[PDB]
Design a binder for this molecule. Structure first.
Ligand SMILES: O=C(O)CCCC[C@@H]1SC[C@@H]2NC(=O)N[C@@H]21
Ligand SMILES: O=C(O)CCCC[C@@H]1SC[C@@H]2NC(=O)N[C@@H]21
Ligand SMILES: O=C(O)CCCC[C@@H]1SC[C@@H]2NC(=O)N[C@@H]21
Ligand SMILES: O=C(O)CCCC[C@@H]1SC[C@@H]2NC(=O)N[C@@H]21
Ligand SMILES: O=C(O)c1cccc(C(=O)O)n1
Ligand SMILES: O=C(O)c1cccc(C(=O)O)n1
Ligand SMILES: O=C(O)c1cccc(C(=O)O)n1
Ligand SMILES: O=C(O)c1cccc(C(=O)O)n1
Ligand SMILES: O=C(O)c1cccc(C(=O)O)n1
Ligand SMILES: O=C(O)c1cccc(C(=O)O)n1
Ligand SMILES: O=C(O)c1cccc(C(=O)O)n1
Ligand SMILES: O=C(O)c1cccc(C(=O)O)n1
Ligand SMILES: O=C(O)c1cccc(C(=O)O)n1
Ligand SMILES: O=C(O)c1cccc(C(=O)O)n1
Ligand SMILES: O=C(O)c1cccc(C(=O)O)n1
Ligand SMILES: O=C(O)c1cccc(C(=O)O)n1
Ligand SMILES: O=C(O)c1cccc(C(=O)O)n1
Ligand SMILES: O=C(O)c1cccc(C(=O)O)n1
Ligand SMILES: O=C(O)c1cccc(C(=O)O)n1
Ligand SMILES: O=C(O)c1cccc(C(=O)O)n1
Ligand SMILES: O=C(O)c1cccc(C(=O)O)n1
Ligand SMILES: O=C(O)c1cccc(C(=O)O)n1
Ligand SMILES: O=C(O)c1cccc(C(=O)O)n1
Ligand SMILES: O=C(O)c1cccc(C(=O)O)n1
Ligand SMILES: O=C(O)c1cccc(C(=O)O)n1
Ligand SMILES: O=C(O)c1cccc(C(=O)O)n1
Ligand SMILES: O=C(O)c1cccc(C(=O)O)n1
Ligand SMILES: O=C(O)c1cccc(C(=O)O)n1
Ligand SMILES: O=C(O)c1cccc(C(=O)O)n1
Ligand SMILES: O=C(O)c1cccc(C(=O)O)n1
Ligand SMILES: O=C(O)c1cccc(C(=O)O)n1
Ligand SMILES: O=C(O)c1cccc(C(=O)O)n1
Ligand SMILES: O=C(O)c1cccc(C(=O)O)n1
Ligand SMILES: O=C(O)c1cccc(C(=O)O)n1
Ligand SMILES: O=C(O)c1cccc(C(=O)O)n1
Ligand SMILES: O=C(O)c1cccc(C(=O)O)n1
Ligand SMILES: O=C(O)c1cccc(C(=O)O)n1
Ligand SMILES: O=C(O)c1cccc(C(=O)O)n1
Ligand SMILES: O=C(O)c1cccc(C(=O)O)n1
Ligand SMILES: O=C(O)c1cccc(C(=O)O)n1
Ligand SMILES: O=C(O)c1cccc(C(=O)O)n1
Ligand SMILES: O=C(O)c1cccc(C(=O)O)n1
Ligand SMILES: O=C(O)c1cccc(C(=O)O)n1
Ligand SMILES: O=C(O)c1cccc(C(=O)O)n1
Ligand SMILES: O=C(O)c1cccc(C(=O)O)n1
Ligand SMILES: O=C(O)c1cccc(C(=O)O)n1
Ligand SMILES: O=C(O)c1cccc(C(=O)O)n1
Ligand SMILES: O=C(O)c1cccc(C(=O)O)n1
Ligand code: NA
Ligand code: NA
Ligand SMILES: [Tb+3]
Ligand SMILES: [Tb+3]
Ligand SMILES: [Tb+3]
Ligand SMILES: [Tb+3]
Ligand SMILES: [Tb+3]
Ligand SMILES: [Tb+3]
Ligand SMILES: [Tb+3]
Ligand SMILES: [Tb+3]
Ligand SMILES: [Tb+3]
Ligand SMILES: [Tb+3]
Ligand SMILES: [Tb+3]
Ligand SMILES: [Tb+3]
Ligand SMILES: [Tb+3]
Ligand SMILES: [Tb+3]
Ligand SMILES: [Tb+3]
Ligand SMILES: [Tb+3]
Lengths: 123, 123, 123, 123
C-alpha cells in the first residue's frame, strides 16, 4: 500500500544519521540504523511498527521503532525508541520524538533517559 | 541468557495493561500488548529490541518496543514506543517512559504526541 | 482559594528531594528546591505557575515550575522544569514529568535533555 | 550580563507564537506568552529561571519557564513548561522541549501530558 511504499527507503536525519527501513504489508518495520553521534559504530538492527491503514483524511501515518545499541563492534548498553509520523508528498518526511534509555543502577535511574527529536528526509 | 530469560514472560503495568513478550537470543523482542485504557480492544502486535549482553556491574538491561494501534478490531491511527530498563531479582520490574504519537494534520502536529511512564511487574 | 491552600506547603518526592512552595492568589508559584541527587547542594530558587481557578469537575490542578541549578554553593549549568497536576484529599499528591536541560555545545545538543517523572507528597 | 542581555527580548517560534521575556540579574525570567495554536487567546503570564553565570566554554545557557493557560479571556486548565538553552550570535536561538499537562481525572491521567519541541528566534 501507499504507506508501505512511502516509508520504505533510506532516510537521513538532521545529525547525518542513516535510517534504512522496509515496511511490511501489515505493520512491520525492519532495517538498520547508523548514528552520526554518540557511542556507536557501524549499523544496528532496528524493528518497529506502523499503521498499515492510515486515515486518508490528511493525517500522517503513525509509526515507531527501536534500536538497542549493541552490534558486533560496540555495546553502549542503551536503547532508543523513536515515535512519530510519516508525511508523504514530493519532500517526504518522518517527524519523530525519541527516548534513549541507558542501563543504570537504581540510584542513577533518575538520569537514565534522554529525550530529543529527529526529523528524517529521503535526501 | 539471563536477560533473555528475565524479560520473557507476562507483565502488567499500573493501569492493568498486559504485556506478553519473548526475548530472542540476540536482541529481538516480540509479543502482544493489551491496553486497559484508550482507543484499544483486544491484543496488538509488538516488536522491539533489548541489550542481549547487558553490563553485569549492577546496571539494568536497556530495552524498547513499539505498538501500532491497529488490529482486527480497531485502528486508533497511533503508535506507542516504550523505552526503559529491566531489573531482575525476586520482584522483577521493567521501568519505562513512553511516547504515543497519533497521526495528525501538520496544523495539529504540535499536539500529536503524549508522554508518560509505565512500570511493569510479573504480578 | 482551595488550590492555593492545597499546593502551598512542603513536599518530598520519591528520591527524597524537598520542594517548598507558596502559591499566590492569581497563579504564581515561588519557593525552593533541594535535590537528593545530582550536581546539587543546598536550596535553589524556583518559580512557576498554576491554574488558580481549576475545574471543579474532578480534574486535578495544572501547574509547572522551573529550577536553574545555580546558587551560592554550586552551578551545574542546567535547568529543570516540572509539569504536572495537583490532586488534593487526605493524601495530597503532585504528579509530574520533568525535563532537565544542560548547557551544551551544538555538537552535543542531541544529549542535552533528560526526562523523568517525580511524584510528591506532603509526607 | 551577556546572558541576561541575550535572552531579554521578543521571540517567535516555528508556530508563530510570541514569547516576550525579561531576564533578571540573578536568574529570574518574567514576561508573556501568546500561542498561535490551541485553547488560547491573548497573552499569558510566564515566569522561569535561567543560569545567570553560564560556562563560557562554548556551551549554551540553560533556562526554563512555565505558562498556566488562564488569563482574563480563557482558562484551558493546563500548563506548559519549556526547558532548553539559549545560543547567541547574530542569529540567536532558544532551543526547547516542552511538556503540556492538562488537569484530568485520575482515570485519564495517562493522557494528561503532551510533549513537543519549539525553536525560537528574534525574527
Ligand atoms: O550513545 C549511545 O548510547 C548510542 C547512540 C545514540 C544516538 C542517538 S539515538 C537518538 C539521536 N538520534 C540519532 O540519530 N543519534 C542520537
Ligand atoms: O488510544 C490509543 O491511541 C491507543 C491506546 C493507547 C494506550 C496507552 S499506550 C501508553 C499507556 N500505557 C498503557 O498500557 N496504555 C496507555
Ligand atoms: O545535576 C544537575 O544538573 C542538577 C540536579 C538535578 C536533579 C534532578 S531534577 C529532576 C530530578 N528530580 C529530583 O528531585 N532530582 C532530579
Ligand atoms: O491548548 C492549551 O491547553 C493551551 C495552549 C497550548 C499551546 C502549546 S504550548 C506548547 C506549544 N508551543 C506553542 O507556542 N503552542 C503550543
Ligand atoms: O499486525 C500484524 O503484524 C499482522 C496483521 C495481519 N501481520
Ligand atoms: O503474528 C504476526 O503477524 C506478528 C507477530 C509479531 C510481530 C509481527 C510483525 O512485526 O509483523 N507480526
Ligand atoms: O557521545 C557520547 O556520550 C559518547 C560517545 C562515545 C563514547 C561514549 C562513552 O564511551 O560514554 N560516549
Ligand atoms: O564524555 C562522555 O560521553 C562521557 C563521560 C563520562 C561518562 C560517560 C558515560 O557514562 O557515557 N560519558
Ligand atoms: O560508524 C560508522 O561506520 C561510521 C561513522 C562515521 N562510518
Ligand atoms: O559498517 C560500516 O560502515 C563500518 C564498520 C566498521 C568500521 C567503519 C568505519 O570505520 O567507517 N564502518
Ligand atoms: O559490513 C561490511 O561488509 C562492510 C562495511 C563497510 N563492507
Ligand atoms: O474500512 C474501514 O474500517 C476504514 C476505512 C477508512 C478509514 C477508516 C478509519 O479511519 O477507521 N476505516
Ligand atoms: O562498547 C563496548 O562493548 C566496550 C567498550 C569499551 C570497553 C569494552 C570492554 O572492555 O568490553 N567494551
Ligand atoms: O569489542 C567489545 O568489547 C565488544 C564488541 C561487541 C559487543 C560487546 C559487548 O556486548 O560487550 N563488546
Ligand atoms: O551511551 C553513551 O555513552 C551515552 C548515553 C547517554 C548519554 C551519554 C552522555 O551523556 O555521555 N552517553
Ligand atoms: O542483532 C541482532 O538481531 C542479531 C545479532 C546476531 N541477530
Ligand atoms: O538480521 C538480523 O538478525 C535481524 C534483522 C532485523 C531484525 C532482527 C531482530 O529483531 O532480531 N534481526
Ligand atoms: O481514551 C481515549 O482517548 C479514547 C478512548 C476510546 C475512544 C477514543 C476515541 O474514539 O477518540 N478515545
Ligand atoms: O474523549 C475522547 O477520547 C476524545 C474526544 C474528542 C476527540 C478525540 C480524539 O480525536 O481522539 N478523543
Ligand atoms: O480489550 C479487551 O479484550 C478487554 C478489555 C477489558 N477485555
Ligand atoms: O482478545 C480478547 O480478549 C478480546 C477480543 C474481542 C473482544 C473482547 C472483549 O470483549 O473482552 N476481548
Ligand atoms: O482470540 C481468540 O480466540 C479469543 C479471544 C478471547 N478466544
Ligand atoms: O566481552 C566483552 O566485550 C564484555 C564483557 C563484559 C562487559 C562488557 C561491556 O560492558 O562492554 N564487555
Ligand atoms: O477504530 C476503527 O477502525 C474505527 C472506529 C470508528 C469508525 C471506523 C470506521 O468508520 O471505519 N473505524
Ligand atoms: O471495524 C473497523 O472499522 C476497523 C477494524 C479494524 C481496522 C480498521 C481500520 O484499519 O480502519 N477498522
Ligand atoms: O487514540 C485516541 O483516541 C487518542 C490518542 C491520544 C489522545 C487521545 C485523547 O486525548 O483523546 N485520544
Ligand atoms: O496571572 C497573573 O499573575 C495575575 C492575574 C491577575 N496576577
Ligand atoms: O503582571 C502580573 O501579575 C505578573 C507578571 C508576571 C508574573 C506574574 C506572576 O508570576 O504572578 N504576574
Ligand atoms: O549525578 C550526577 O551527574 C553528578 C553528581 C555530582 C556531580 C556531577 C558532575 O560534576 O557532573 N554529576
Ligand atoms: O559521573 C558523572 O556525573 C559525570 C561523568 C562525566 C561527565 C559528567 C558531566 O559532564 O556531568 N558527569
Ligand atoms: O544539599 C544539602 O544541603 C544536603 C544534601 C544531603 N544536606
Ligand atoms: O542549606 C543547606 O542545607 C546546606 C548548605 C550547605 C551545606 C549543607 C550540608 O553540607 O548539608 N547544607
Ligand atoms: O542557610 C542557612 O543559614 C543554614 C543552612 C543550613 N543554616
Ligand atoms: O465562571 C467561570 O468562567 C467558570 C466557572 C466554573 C468553571 C469554569 C471553566 O471550567 O471554565 N469557568
Ligand atoms: O559547581 C560549580 O560552580 C563548580 C564546580 C567545579 C568547579 C568550578 C570552578 O572551577 O568554578 N565550579
Ligand atoms: O564555588 C564555585 O565555583 C561556584 C559557586 C557558586 C556559583 C558558581 C558559578 O556560578 O560558577 N561557582
Ligand atoms: O549536572 C550534571 O552533572 C549532570 C546533568 C545531567 C546529566 C548528568 C550525567 O548524566 O552525569 N550530569
Ligand atoms: O537566585 C536568585 O534569584 C538570586 C540570587 C542572588 N536572586
Ligand atoms: O529570594 C530571591 O531572590 C528569590 C526568591 C524566589 C524567586 C526569585 C527569582 O525568581 O529571582 N528570587
Ligand atoms: O487545539 C486544541 O485542542 C483546542 C483549541 C481550541 C479549543 C479547544 C478545546 O476547547 O478543547 N482545543
Ligand atoms: O478538538 C479538540 O480540541 C477537542 C475535542 C474534544 C475534546 C477536547 C479537549 O477535551 O480539549 N478537545
Ligand atoms: O490571541 C490573540 O490575541 C490572537 C490570535 C491570533 N490575535
Ligand atoms: O491581547 C490581544 O492581542 C487580544 C486580546 C483579545 C482579543 C484579541 C484578538 O481578537 O486578536 N487580541
Ligand atoms: O490589551 C490591550 O489593551 C490591547 C490588546 C490588543 N490593546
Ligand atoms: O568563578 C567561578 O566559579 C567560575 C568561573 C567560570 C566558570 C565557572 C564554572 O563553569 O563553574 N565558575
Ligand atoms: O475557557 C474558559 O474559561 C471557558 C471555556 C468555555 C466555557 C467556559 C465556561 O462555561 O466558563 N469557560
Ligand atoms: O469567559 C470565561 O469563562 C472565563 C474567562 C477567564 C477565566 C475563566 C476561568 O478561569 O474559568 N473563564
Ligand atoms: O487545552 C486544550 O484544548 C487541549 C490541551 C491538550 C490537548 C488537547 C487536544 O488534544 O485537544 N486540547
Ligand atoms: Na520497536
Ligand atoms: Na517556571
Ligand atoms: Tb505480522
Ligand atoms: Tb557517554
Ligand atoms: Tb563506515
Ligand atoms: Tb564489550
Ligand atoms: Tb536477529
Ligand atoms: Tb480519544
Ligand atoms: Tb478480552
Ligand atoms: Tb475503521
Ligand atoms: Tb501576578
Ligand atoms: Tb554529571
Ligand atoms: Tb543540608
Ligand atoms: Tb564555578
Ligand atoms: Tb531573585
Ligand atoms: Tb482541545
Ligand atoms: Tb490579538
Ligand atoms: Tb470559564
Amino acid at each position: 500500500g501507499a504507506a508501505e511504499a512511502g516509508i520504505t527507503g533510506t532516510w537521513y536525519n538532521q545529525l547525518g544519521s542513516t535510517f534504512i527501513v522496509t515496511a511490511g504489508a501489515d505493520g512491520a518495520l525492519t532495517g538498520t540504523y547508523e548514528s552520526a553521534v554518540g557511542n556507536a559504530e557501524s549499523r544496528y538492527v532496528l524493528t518497529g511498527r506502523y499503521d498499515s491503514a492510515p486515515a486518508t483524511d490528511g493525517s500522517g501515518t503513525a509509526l515507531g521503532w527501536t534500536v538497542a545499541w549493541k552490534n558486533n563492534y560496540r555495546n553502549a548498553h542503551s536503547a532508543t525508541t523513536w515515535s512519530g509520523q510519516y508525511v508523504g508528498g514530493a519532500e517526504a518526511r518522518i517527524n519523530t520524538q525519541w527516548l534513549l534509555t541507558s542501563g543504570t543502577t537504581e540510584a542513577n535511574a533518575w538520569k537514565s533517559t534522554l529525550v530529543g527529536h529527529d526529523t528524517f528526509t529521503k535526501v
